[PDB]
Amino acid sequence: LDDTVQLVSGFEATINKFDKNFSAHLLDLLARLSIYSTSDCEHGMASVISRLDFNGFYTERLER
Amino acid sequence: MPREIITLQLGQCGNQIGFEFWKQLCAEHGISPEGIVEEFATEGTDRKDVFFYQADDEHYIPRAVLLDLEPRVIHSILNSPYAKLYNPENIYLSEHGGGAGNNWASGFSQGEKIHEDIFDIIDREADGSDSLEGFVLCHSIAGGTGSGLGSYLLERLNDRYPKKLVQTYSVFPNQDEMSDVVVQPYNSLLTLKRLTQNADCVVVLDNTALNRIATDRLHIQNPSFSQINQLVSTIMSASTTTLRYPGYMNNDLIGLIASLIPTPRLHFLMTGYTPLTTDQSVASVRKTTVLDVMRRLLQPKNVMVSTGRDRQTNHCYIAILNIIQGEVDPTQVHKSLQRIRERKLANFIPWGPASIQVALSRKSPYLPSAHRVSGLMMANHTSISSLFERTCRQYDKLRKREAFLEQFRKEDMFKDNFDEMDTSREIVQQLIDEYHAATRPDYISWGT
Amino acid sequence: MPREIITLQLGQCGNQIGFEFWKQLCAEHGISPEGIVEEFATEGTDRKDVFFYQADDEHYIPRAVLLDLEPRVIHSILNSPYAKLYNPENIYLSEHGGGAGNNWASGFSQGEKIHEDIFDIIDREADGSDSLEGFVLCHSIAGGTGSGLGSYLLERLNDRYPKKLVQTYSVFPNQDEMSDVVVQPYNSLLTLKRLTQNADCVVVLDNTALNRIATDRLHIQNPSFSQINQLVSTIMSASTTTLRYPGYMNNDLIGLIASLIPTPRLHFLMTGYTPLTTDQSVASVRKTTVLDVMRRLLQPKNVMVSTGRDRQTNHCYIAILNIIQGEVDPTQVHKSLQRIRERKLANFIPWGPASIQVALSRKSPYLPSAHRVSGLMMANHTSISSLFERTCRQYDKLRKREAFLEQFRKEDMFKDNFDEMDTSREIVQQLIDEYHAATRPDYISWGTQEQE
Amino acid sequence: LDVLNKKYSLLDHMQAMRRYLLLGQGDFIRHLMDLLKPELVRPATTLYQHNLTGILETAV
Structure with a gap:
């Protein structure tokens, strides 16, 4: 369809904030998955985890 | 309904690649050169409607458009058994037949001259597609027709079909060989301009890499244009296998390309093929494991791209998609x-x-x-x-x-x-x- | 993962020894002359990756580098049946083919001139090694190529691979024969200097002792380099068996030698082999006892190192390690x-x-x-x-x-x-x-600059 | 005895105990220790059981 530039920048900022929240919830999900994989010895979830942080993006969050 | 794909083969190299691709697809699907399904072609498990159209309940016709600015190659194609595979209503031929003279600017001017014919062919083919995703152009960036006419076609498709996906099969000029085409850098520049402004996806096909692979991997001392075209057809077949072998995942082009293009700007794709074998080494079916397969695929000798040894840049993979075919x-x-x-x-x-x-x-x-x-x-x-x-x-x-x-x-x-x-x-x-920046964490701000 | 070892064969004698070593290793591992594991070699219990690289899922390529400043020996190696066993990217041949002329200084200058090319070849071979430990140099100290080129290569490896161990098998000139190379003692001295400064371990191979053993034990009046190389290949096979026969202990060379080299200066190693048998006596697998083994080992005829009779120093054994193979x-x-x-x-x-x-x-x-x-x-x-x-x-x-x-x-x-x-x-x-100090309690201060 | 051998591999289980639990696979133990050094040097309170199991599988 496109103050309009300000609206676009605000939308981008809101998207980035939602993305931050999503990433935090995803890291919490990965932690819960790790807990479940350690309880149930589910190698599948460990393979999923190794897939998820191939570039190590999630590795620092897991350490945190 | 399947997302039909129109294949545009541009200039000598692009038209040869398209013809060999259609031949390979026919052979893989058991389709006769006339577009009729052979009696042995009982495996209805392929999704032809993505790349082929059914002319009748029995005849599958490739959704292929053969485009040249010079009539010699089109006439040579029309003398093959596969003349009936393509829909003739999707074929636009430049009236002048003179080609672009290996000049991108000439190819663009010829496209402008055949603009009406080309867009009429495109619309005629588009109406035959139930859920057309977009157009796929197969061309060379070094010539005139596939480069210039291809760029013109890309520009006009972008202007006219802004909601359709644009994939290209773009043969890039050999960068390690001194090109005899002194204007190849001009042709390459115009093609890169259009890819930056008007293409959505550029598949780079480096003739230098093709020659290198033929020599080192195919053990071909002097790779013929035909051998390069057959290798390219094998690559295209592998790229279309997910359409030809339907499964649980990656059943659509957007699903295939999403993993390769993280951002709209990062739309330059590299290709890889496996197993890479010399023509002589077909004999031994090696029980290659997925680890063994990937290891051979990870070997540059099996990689379908000849990248120079840059000593200054710590080049890295931005993303990898491995499409493995077979058991x-x-x-x-x-x-x-x-x-x-x-x-x-x-x-x-x-x-x-x-x-x-x-x-x-x-x-x-x-x-x-x-x-x-x-x-x-x-x-x-x-x-x-x-x-x-x-x-x-x-x-x-x-x-x-x-x-x-x-x-x-x-x-x-x-x-x-x-x-x-x-x-x-x-x-x-x-x-x-x-x-190079995409190998670094600061790639998030790269280009800002 | 195994600690891969790159084998460097230098000069005529070193390259012949390396070739025979690779033949012996292939025979011990059941590798065909093309580098492929034989179908009968179903015991996948050997660690090839310590000493060999896999060329394919079936083909094992020796982690061996054949280095000469003269092309004749490299061409002769490439004409053997084992030419296909080795990875061709690990083969460096001097383009000039002229060798060092039995001059250590010439060999060193040639190594310096081919430093970039040699290290590119070495890196290409290194990428085939999953956990390369270091390089082993097989060479003569009396010639030009194995001494000089070997010294240059050792210097450049020490500079480039300062964290990797560098062991050498250095063939010393026959000391009982008058060398026709009047400068052979000078070449040997320069090579020993470089071994002192840039090598971590020098295995001394005295051609005089090899000739003497061939004469008295093999009944060979004039021991050829090839016969010495075959004996050396047998010795190398025995030394690598613990890599080729994995077990609980001594699975790596550094673990084996650590007990032997207390200080960097005490880097002169002696060798011993047992049982020593003439080729004809292969028939009877003698039930040699550990006591019998130890008794035969104490005979100087069975020691694979020709140490001079020092009359001034009360030489003594500091430590002994016996590697025994068999039941x-x-x-x-x-x-x-x-x-x-x-x-x-x-x-x-x-x-x-x-x-x-x-x-x-x-x-x-x-x-x-x-x-x-x-x-x-x-x-x-x-x-x-x-x-x-x-x-x-x-x-x-x-x-x-x-x-x-x-x-x-x-x-x-x-x-x-x-x-x-x-x-x-x-x-x-x-x-x-x-x-001499190491025979004495004051060895605690041996190698201290105040004691030097 | 035939049942124990065929169904529970009792002698084979003992041989496995020798190779692994008795550290008979010395090269494996060496490589495992080399990989573990950066992990085993860390405080045991910092060890993740899932991470240790994944490292074990990787070393194997």
Whole structure:
């Protein structure tokens, strides 16, 4: 369809904030998955985890 | 309904690639040269409607458009048994038959002259598609027709079909060989300009890499155009296998390309093929494991891209998609990924999470495969910039020498200036740097 | 993962030894002349990755680098049946083919000139190694290529791979034969200097001892380089068996040698082999006992190191490691050690607790062994300094006569002076003094600059 | 005895105990320790059981 530039920048900022929240919830999900994989010895979830942080993006969050 | 794909084959090289692709698809699907399904072609498991149309309940016609500005090649194609595979209503031929003279500017001018015919052909083919995703152009970037006419077609498709996907099969000029086409850097620049402004996806096909692979991997001392075309047809077949071997995943082009293009700007794709074998080595069906398959695929000798050894840039993979075809054990895939991670066989982007996607695919049932397992690699690797950087360096070498520019100034597209070539060179340099930047965490702010 | 070892074969003698070593390793591992594991070689229990690389899922390629400054030997290697066993990217041949002319200085200059190309080849071979530990150089110290090119390569490897171990198998000139190469003692001195400064371990191979053994034991009047190379290949096979027959202990070279080299200066290793048998006596697998093994090992005829008779230094054994191959009973080993101690069959260092270590090893399953029991002796004996002192004396004998020195003065390494020979003499003197000190309790201060 | 051998591999289980639990696979133990050094040097409170199991599988 496109103050309009300000609206676009605000939308981008809101998207980035939602993305931050999503990433935090995803890291919490990965932690819960790790807990479940350690309880149930589910190698599948460990393979999923190794897939998820191939570039190590999630590795620092897991350490945190 | 399937998302039909119209295949546009442009210039001598592009038209040869398209013809060999249609031949290979017919052979894999058991389709006769006339477009009729052979009685042996009972495996209705392929999705032809993505790339082929049914002319009747029995006859499948390729959704292929053969486009040339010179009549010689089109007439030679029309003398093959496969003349009936393509819909003639989707074929636009330039009336002048003179070609582009290996001049991109001439190709663009010819496209402008055949614009009406080309868009009429495109619309006629579009109405035959139930859920047309977009158009796929197969062309060379070094010639005139496939480069110039291809760029014109891309521009007009972008203007007219802004809601359709645009994939290209773009044959890039050899960057390691001194091109006899002194205007190849001009042609390459115009093609890169259009890819930056008007293409959504550029599949780079480096003739230098094709020759290198034929020599080192196919053991072909002097690779013929025909052998390169057959290798390209094998690659295209592998790229279309997910359409030809339907499965649980990656059943659509957007699903295939999403993993390769993380951002709209990062739309430059590199290709990989597996298993790479010399024609003589067909004899031994090696029980290659997914780990073994990936390891051979990870070998540059098996890589379908000849990147120079850049000593200055720590090139890395931005993204990897492995399409594996044939009998695949999931546990072997898991072990392969495990071994790849343990061995750090792939470097991923530092600015975001990146990994090697692995797809397992069936082979075509109508074509007996000598190999139990085959594989395609799609990868975003910063060393592919070295091919692009090498092309840019050759462009700069010609532009700094103003070599053969008087012939382009003879053509209206280049008559007044070569500013499009210089902007293309700058954009390609920025692309090389971004591909190098994409190996670094600061790639998040790269290009800002 | 295995600690891969790159084998460097230098000059005519070194390259022949490397070729025969690769043949022996292939035979022990059941690798075909093309590098492919034979179908009968179903025991996947060997660790090829320590010494071999896989060329394919079936083809094992030796982690061996054949290096010469003269193309004749490399071409002769490429004409053998084993040409397809090795990875061709690990083969470096000097383009000029002229060799070093039996001049260490010329070999060093050639190594310096081919440093970039050689290190590119080395890196190409290294990528085929999953966990490359380091390089092993097989060479002669008397020639030009194996001595000079070997010294240059050792220097560049030490500079480039400062964290990797560098062991050398250095073939020393025959000391009982008058060398026609009057500058051979100078070349040997320069090579020993470089081994002192840039090598971590030098295995001394005296051509005089090889010829003597061939004459008295093999009945070979004129031992060829090939016969010496086949004996060396047998020795190398025995030394690599613990890599080829994995077990609980001694799975790596560094673990084996750590007990032997207390200080960087005490880097002169002695070798021993058992059982020593003539080729004709293969028929009877003699049930040699650990006591019998130890008794035969103490015979100088069975020691694979020719240490000079030092009359000035009360040379003694600091420590002994016996690598025994074949069927060994642990209780027999214990009783043998007890008997050796009671019989004082081994002298230990006077400055610390020391004993005779005993290793029991399996034979290669792919190679039929004619002997029920085989053994390697590793010993630290101060008389090995006398071999180095003898080399120094030969160097001094040539330098004092300036014999054949003009050929070395043609090469930059020896053009201005013979300082490498004098440094070799000083290093051998320090080695002699430390070896004498190592027989004494004051060895605790041996190698301290105040003691030097 | 036949049942124990065929169904529970009792003698084979003992051989496995020798190779692994008795550290008979010395090369494996060496490589495992080399990989573990950066992990085993860390405080045991910092060890993740899932991470240790994944490292074990990778070393194997």
